[PDB]
Design a binder for this molecule. Structure first.
Ligand SMILES: C[C@@H]1C[C@@H]2[C@H]3Cn4c(cccc4=O)[C@@H](CN2C)[C@H]31
Ligand SMILES: C[C@@H]1C[C@@H]2[C@H]3Cn4c(cccc4=O)[C@@H](CN2C)[C@H]31
Ligand SMILES: C[C@@H]1C[C@@H]2[C@H]3Cn4c(cccc4=O)[C@@H](CN2C)[C@H]31
Ligand SMILES: C[C@@H]1C[C@@H]2[C@H]3Cn4c(cccc4=O)[C@@H](CN2C)[C@H]31
Ligand SMILES: C[C@@H]1C[C@@H]2[C@H]3Cn4c(cccc4=O)[C@@H](CN2C)[C@H]31
Ligand SMILES: *[C@@H]1O[C@H](CO)[C@@H](O)[C@H](O)[C@H]1NC(C)=O
Ligand SMILES: *[C@@H]1O[C@H](CO)[C@@H](O)[C@H](O)[C@H]1NC(C)=O
Ligand SMILES: *[C@@H]1O[C@H](CO)[C@@H](O)[C@H](O)[C@H]1NC(C)=O
Lengths: 205, 205, 205, 205, 205
């Protein structure tokens, strides 16, 4: 405990806080989804409700330490309030995201961070035809709200959404689920913004 | 990071906070809407629910810096809590506005600020006739709750609401959408208050 | 800005906070309502939902300044958290009040304050007969929860509720709307408590 | 104001906070209910919703003062955050309690405190038969969640719930309403826990 | 009170906060459930709502004291904010958990802690067949969100859920209710995570 207390104190009390990524020092965030449930479909508003875990990974030089100086500690858990976290946002939500998991991340000695918030999201999707064999397809993009591709880039480790925790007695069965990097351009703004597009194809069970 | 950390520290730790606009030093806020979805209509309460992005722009001398003194930094992202933001409020809401995007703004070296909150709003609107060819028209005014025209003025860059991110499979298609500056007077209060009136004409798709 | 920054600092950093009104130094609060909408009626729970602005006015010696010492500033806007505000409470609500406007007040050099929160309120009201010509009458009292008449008194400027921003396409039209000072006595407590009784008579449009 | 400011400062800035009651220094809390409305009944979930005021009284030596030293002040109003309050909790709620009144208490020079929170509570109750002449009976216990009888005891001034503010046009009329001290024992825990059991018998009006 | 004030001050003001469990200093948390009500079932979303108390127990060397040095005090109640608490999380919730009891724990002189939060939980469960003699079975896992088995292990005192406070007039009667330790492995992560699996079998009464 003494060694971890020292490490956290050296990292968090001494530092002026990380001011986010910049054009000179950009950052790549890795995203992965594990889809747990399609809870609800609303055909009168074209809203669909998902429950998933969003795995986020990034790496900061300012979170590095030498494990030899801190009793061989290679990593630790810490409150997400102690650190910067990326502003990854759904581009087509219809409600504030509801947070289902404790806001705690894992920091590793090389400065890498893993953060896995569980969320419930309502987003724009037309479920008409969900009761057929073909099913429906729906999509929602996730990216930084405020940082362009020149400050935050995204990648995935796989294009396959993790379906191994999908609720087996859901009202909806999943036919496929992909997560794919894209580049968007907007009327408001000159620079490209990066997203990962979660595409889910499903039907009634 | 070092240069941005310095800049933020020089702007935000040293300063007593900006105390808002005054009659002697008034401010013009530019507003623009991009309408994403008419999610829901309630014909038993005459409430309609929109999802949009509200682009806000203003400029303060106290947020100026010389980029040459801070490693050629011309702009940065920062939490909206670090700065003053205008109290732009819908005049006919029926619920607290729900915030859908991170509360982060962009500050530029000339002291100009851009802030683009995504919101879901329930407001007063009679949807009777939405299922016809003619459709319905509805309106909501946005302005400072507490500052008159002598402290906060508003303008738009265009009278055309941006419909280029409008959800193509919404239950409602948009026939027109305008945003127009107006001047209001109230029994309580001697001075004029400025608003931008969002007028949306729509029908079932 | 320099002069207002000084004024706010002199008023709020130097002061120990106002400890509320007392028997020795009582306060009169002026209340006025402007009724915007009867949004909803629930005949299975006898709850009705209003949207209104509640104009509050009072005066404290501790908020006085000489405008000559602060660049001729006669008034300013400030966050309601910076100052004491009266605990005016609906006596027959069925839900927490929802706040629809920014919590910002106007302080004037003589120590007078104006604060105008927009609220949505669910309160106890039997709507049976609302669909008739006679309509229904409902009532809700507003007063200090904790201060008697010997510490907080109330008055109105008029007994007529302001109907000039009433939503013209509401489901309910207003037949009359009054706001009247009353004195209540309770088993628990020896002293009188003051309220303003909002009486609204309405029917389907 | 000067004298009250001094008193509050002497009581709250100088003190280390009261650490709650103990076996060596136990406390008796007096409870009384005034029932305002049975708002809603849900026969598909067996939940019933009440609105009431819960009068709480207790006394601490650490809140004593000599009125002669503070300009003859015998009592004052203060925010409930300034002081310890008992953790009185409904034992069979189905939702977090909703608070309907300002969190402000009255402290008197002998160290006694009065606190009267207005609440809306959903609790476990089977309303089947509410539409008959006999009506239904329902019950909910209120006590400390964490303190046994050896640290917190309870009493009532009367076994009769105060029905003098009961909403006359409620959907439900009250046949009887009692509040009675009881002693409970639990598998988890060796000591007795005290409650006041609110028993309400009611039917459709 | 003097003695307890000293103890709390010595434990909480002097200490740098416990930084959670580690591989070098792991922790075992004991969990037990007492099921109070199955409130609601939603067959269109496959969500079920429970109300229960979750008894949590663990032990830290840094919370030890010698009762002889503090007036023979063997234990005390304190706010949960004063101490570390395990991040025990439902793995298949569909909404944020609603907290129904005060966030206060009991600390004992040997460093052991007891914490018993009452919760309402919506979780993934197919109620189809609940209206039959056989009923339905549903399950939800509870464990650390972020700590593996090498930092947080779990155990139960019994595999039998405590049904002695189960609401006798619930819509649903309980046929069986068990709580059983398990070990999970996830695609994201190399180490095992421990849970207690709450299995409830029930039907309409
Ligand atoms: C219309 C664009 C979509 C969304 C908006 C928010 N936004 C942007 C740039 C800078 C700051 C900012 O808040 C753009 C990119 N964002 C992902 C716009
Ligand atoms: C009834 C008026 C509309 C709305 C209200 C709130 N308000 C005002 C002035 C100063 C402070 C203030 O809170 C007025 C202007 N506002 C836009 C009134
Ligand atoms: C039953 C009374 C109604 C309401 C309650 C709250 N209250 C009071 C006195 C002191 C403090 C206080 O909280 C009384 C006056 N208030 C307006 C009681
Ligand atoms: C199952 C029991 C009912 C409730 C629970 C919470 N509780 C207790 C003791 C100490 C701390 C504590 O949180 C007991 C008494 N409480 C009123 C248990
Ligand atoms: C998909 C896994 C389930 C859940 C998630 C959250 N989580 C984990 C490890 C480290 C940090 C973290 O936040 C894993 C274990 N947890 C119980 C994943
Ligand atoms: C800033 O601008 C000049 C001119 O382009 C450049 O050569 C210089 O190296 C820059 N300074 C820093 C610290 O990046
Ligand atoms: C306070 O005490 C008594 C109360 O009757 C009174 O005679 C005296 O005038 C009061 N004095 C002050 C300074 O308040
Ligand atoms: C504590 O216990 C001892 C006996 O074990 C006793 O002598 C002492 O008086 C006790 N503490 C008190 C009275 O505070």
């Amino acid at each position: 405990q003494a060694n971890l207390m020292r490490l956290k104190s050296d990292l968090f009390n001494r530092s002026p806080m990380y001011p986010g990524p910049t054009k000179d020092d950009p950052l790549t965030v890795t995203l992965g989804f594990t889809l747990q449930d399609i809870v609800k479909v609303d055909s009168s508003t074209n809203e669909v409700d998902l429950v998933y875990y969003e795995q986020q990974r990034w790496k900061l030089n300012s979170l590095m330490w030498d494990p030899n100086e801190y009793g061989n500690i290679t990593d630790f858990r810490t409150s997400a309030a102690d650190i910067w976290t990326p502003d990854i946002t759904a581009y087509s939500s219809t409600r504030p995201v509801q947070v289902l998991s404790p806001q705690i991340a894992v920091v590793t000695h090389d400065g890498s961070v893993m953060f896995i918030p569980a969320q419930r999201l309502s987003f724009m999707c037309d479920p008409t035809g969900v009761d057929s064999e073909e099913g429906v397809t729906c999509a929602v993009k996730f990216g930084s709200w405020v940082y362009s591709g020149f400050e935050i880039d995204l990648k995935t480790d796989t294009d396959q959404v993790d379906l191994s925790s999908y609720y087996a007695s859901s009202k909806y069965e999943i036919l496929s689920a992909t997560q794919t990097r894209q580049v968007q351009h907007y009327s408001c703004c000159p620079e490209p913004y990066i997203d990962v597009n979660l595409v889910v194809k499903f039907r009634e069970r």
